[PDB]
Amino acid sequence: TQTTGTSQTIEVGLWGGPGGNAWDDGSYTGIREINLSHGDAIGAFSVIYDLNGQPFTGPTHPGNEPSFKTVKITLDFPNEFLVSVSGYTGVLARLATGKDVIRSLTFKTNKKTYGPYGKEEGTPFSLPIENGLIVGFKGRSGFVVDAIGFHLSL
Amino acid sequence: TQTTGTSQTIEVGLWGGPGGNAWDDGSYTGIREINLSHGDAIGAFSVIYDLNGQPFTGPTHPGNEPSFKTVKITLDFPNEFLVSVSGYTGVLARLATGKDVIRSLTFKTNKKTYGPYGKEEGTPFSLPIENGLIVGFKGRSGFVVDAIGFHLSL
Amino acid sequence: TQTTGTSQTIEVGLWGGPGGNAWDDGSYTGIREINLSHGDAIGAFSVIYDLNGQPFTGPTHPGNEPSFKTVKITLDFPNEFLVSVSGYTGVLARLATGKDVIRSLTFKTNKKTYGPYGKEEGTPFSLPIENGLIVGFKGRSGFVVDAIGFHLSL
Amino acid sequence: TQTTGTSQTIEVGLWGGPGGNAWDDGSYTGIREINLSHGDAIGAFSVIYDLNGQPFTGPTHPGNEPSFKTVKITLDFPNEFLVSVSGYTGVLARLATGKDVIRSLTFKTNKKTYGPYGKEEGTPFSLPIENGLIVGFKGRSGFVVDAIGFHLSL
Numbered sequence: 019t020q021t022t023g024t025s026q027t028i029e030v031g032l033w034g035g036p037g038g039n040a041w042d043d044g045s046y047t048g049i050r051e052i053n054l055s056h057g058d059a060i061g062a063f064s065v066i067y068d069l070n071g072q073p074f075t076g077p078t079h080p081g082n083e084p085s086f087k088t089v090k091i092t093l094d095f096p097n098e099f100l101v102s103v104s105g106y107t108g109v110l111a112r113l114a115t116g117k118d119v120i121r122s123l124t125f126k127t128n129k130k131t132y133g134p135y136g137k138e139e140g141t142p143f144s145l146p147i148e149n150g151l152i153v154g155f156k157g158r159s160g161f162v163v164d165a166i167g168f169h170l171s172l
Numbered sequence: 173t174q175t176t177g178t179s180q181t182i183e184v185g186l187w188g189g190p191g192g193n194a195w196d197d198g199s200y201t202g203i204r205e206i207n208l209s210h211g212d213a214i215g216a217f218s219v220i221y222d223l224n225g226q227p228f229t230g231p232t233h234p235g236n237e238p239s240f241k242t243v244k245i246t247l248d249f250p251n252e253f254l255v256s257v258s259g260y261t262g263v264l265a266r267l268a269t270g271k272d273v274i275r276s277l278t279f280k281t282n283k284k285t286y287g288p289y290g291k292e293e294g295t296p297f298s299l300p301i302e303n304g305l306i307v308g309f310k311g312r313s314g315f316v317v318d319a320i321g322f323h324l325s326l
Numbered sequence: 327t328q329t330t331g332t333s334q335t336i337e338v339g340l341w342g343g344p345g346g347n348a349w350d351d352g353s354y355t356g357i358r359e360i361n362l363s364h365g366d367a368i369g370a371f372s373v374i375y376d377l378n379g380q381p382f383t384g385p386t387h388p389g390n391e392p393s394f395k396t397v398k399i400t401l402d403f404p405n406e407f408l409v410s411v412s413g414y415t416g417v418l419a420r421l422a423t424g425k426d427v428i429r430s431l432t433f434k435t436n437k438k439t440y441g442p443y444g445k446e447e448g449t450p451f452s453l454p455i456e457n458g459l460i461v462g463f464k465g466r467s468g469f470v471v472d473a474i475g476f477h478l479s480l
Numbered sequence: 481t482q483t484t485g486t487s488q489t490i491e492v493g494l495w496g497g498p499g500g501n502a503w504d505d506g507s508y509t510g511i512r513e514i515n516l517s518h519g520d521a522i523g524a525f526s527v528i529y530d531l532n533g534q535p536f537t538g539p540t541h542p543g544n545e546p547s548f549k550t551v552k553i554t555l556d557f558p559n560e561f562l563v564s565v566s567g568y569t570g571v572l573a574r575l576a577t578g579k580d581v582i583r584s585l586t587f588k589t590n591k592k593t594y595g596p597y598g599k600e601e602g603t604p605f606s607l608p609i610e611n612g613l614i615v616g617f618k619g620r621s622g623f624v625v626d627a628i629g630f631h632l633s634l
């Protein structure tokens with residue numbers, strides 16, 4: 019029985035720690051571009067989604083670490099799409115929190131692999147996808163990316 | 173196995189005739205407002221969708237009947253949502269095509285009923301929903317709304 | 327946020343009256359065969375669903391009209407599937423209920439059309455499908471099929 | 481547009497190695513009971529799924545480990561359901577294959593945590609779920625569980 023007016027999607031995650039502040043881009047129809055920054059961890063994470071055949075810039079999550087290396091991943095949408103997302107979660111000493119954050123991220127599409135970005139240290143995690151698509155990102159950010167999760171759809 | 177980068181939704185319809193030009197707004201996360209015009213049939217039809225908590229103006233489908241009366245259905249989103257859409261499909265004498273067009277439309281939410289709009293003549297049709305939501309509209313339009321269909325999602 | 331252990335599917339309908347007793351076959355992987363009976367209305371209705379590549383006999387809804395013509399619709403699963411279900415709802419005088427029942431049903435697959443079964447009198451209804459599949463039937467039955475609805479899935 | 485009569489679900493995984501023989505239980509509407517055996521790895525793995533309110537015995541994947549202790553996880557379905565499945569993948573010396581297998585598994589429902597089962601050695605993996613349900617299991621098995629994956633649905 020329907021009890022709310024907002025549609026929903028399957029959501030997996032989050033991988034990472036409880037620090038930072040929660041954010042959720044919601045869901046769209048695909049992924050066109052990913053902009054992130056990295057160093058000893060993943061700092062910024064912002065996405066340009068596809069919305070019914072046209073680009074749609076999602077809310078930004080730059081974090082507050084200005085010294086990281088910036089990276090732009092432009093996917094050959096719609097022929098190229100993610101088939102796997104993996105990374106590492108662990109404590110970053112200079113944060114003085116003792117709580118896990120996203121240390122590294124790797125993006126694998128049906129065409130190639132982007133990454134690893136950041137530092138592969140801590141506990142690894144991976145989300146291989148056999149059927150379906152990531153149609154949205156969610157997570158937690160403070161100084162850097164604390165945690166990440168994904169909205170999935172057929 | 174995934175073979176495309178564009179996600180999908182269930183699609184039902186179309187109800188109505190083969191006339192006019194086909195249109196499809198695509199899919200979103202909900203419905204915020206519906207703007208239509210009616211006389212001896214449904215003329216204009218445009219929707220303001222919800223996209224992850226923010227309104228998104230969908231493509232317009234004004235048709236071409238300057239004499240029709242305009243109507244604005246502003247839903248109390250997300251608390252209020254459609255639980256049924258019904259209407260009538262039939263020929264319009266002045267079109268002299270022998271083909272059906274959307275003569276009438278009635279929108280029923282969990283809070284109230286809007287309509288009927290237009291003229292309830294021809295063959296009735298209806299889409300009562302028990303679980304899930306309409307997250308997008310599609311159809312065909314010329315001078316009036318020739319046909320209509322819906323994208324559905326949980 | 328998940329709150330129950332039972333998965334769900336989009337559900338449309340019901341079309342028909344409030345008489346008889348409610349039933350819901352639930353959802354499966356597809357439809358292999360439909361067995362029904364018809365005369366001046368639709369009497370018995372039971373389905374052989376597909377459950378992950380193997381047939382699964384669904385709950386029976388025999389009704390109580392022994393005089394009806396019995397029909398078996400064996401689909402060439404999985405290449406053949408329903409793209410539309412339509413019919414008529416209305417009062418059947420002899421039932422002495424004054425409530426609408428399923429007077430007629432027509433099943434259209436991508437290969438051919440089965441029916442019309444029963445009597446095409448009353449109010450028509452139709453569910454044409456552009457994307458997705460009927461993966462389960464639900465409704466209400468007494469001596470005949472009082473109402474019917476469908477579970478949809480990609 | 482629909483082009484096949486077989487419905488589908490999102491599928492994630494597999495986690496583990498390439499050894500053993502592939503299997504896929506397919507999808508259902510829930511999980512009632514999980515049966516497995518464990519020692520220095522996960523040996524047997526079977527499930528009693530829910531299929532529209534009734535139990536459905538899933539295909540068996542006993543592997544072949546006489547010394548492994550057997551566990552029967554009977555969930556308080558439908559109120560109790562998995563919110564996370566995690567474990568470890570890695571080589572098991574005695575198998576003499578040099579390929580990764582499922583060394584350990586932990587099941588976390590909204591009520592309690594079951595496990596860890598087996599030995600937490602090798603590379604960890606985890607599937608936390610925020611929205612949706614695991615409605616089917618798939619993987620590869622030989623003497624033990626070589627790999628595992630999941631079918632997800634709302």
Ligand SMILES: OC[C@H]1O[C@H](O)[C@@H](O)[C@@H](O)[C@@H]1O
Binds near residue numbers: 037038160
């Ligand atoms: O983002 C990493 C870290 O940044 C700051 O130290 C704070 O916002 C923490 O709460 C957060 O965990």
Ligand SMILES: OC[C@H]1O[C@H](O)[C@@H](O)[C@@H](O)[C@@H]1O
Binds near residue numbers: 346347
């Ligand atoms: O099925 C038609 C009719 O059969 C019986 O008379 C009863 O079960 C009614 O409630 C039902 O409407």
Ligand SMILES: OC[C@H]1O[C@H](O)[C@@H](O)[C@@H](O)[C@@H]1O
Binds near residue numbers: 498501621622624
């Ligand atoms: O299951 C572990 C192992 O068992 C046997 O040795 C074979 O079936 C292998 O292919 C498999 O990897």
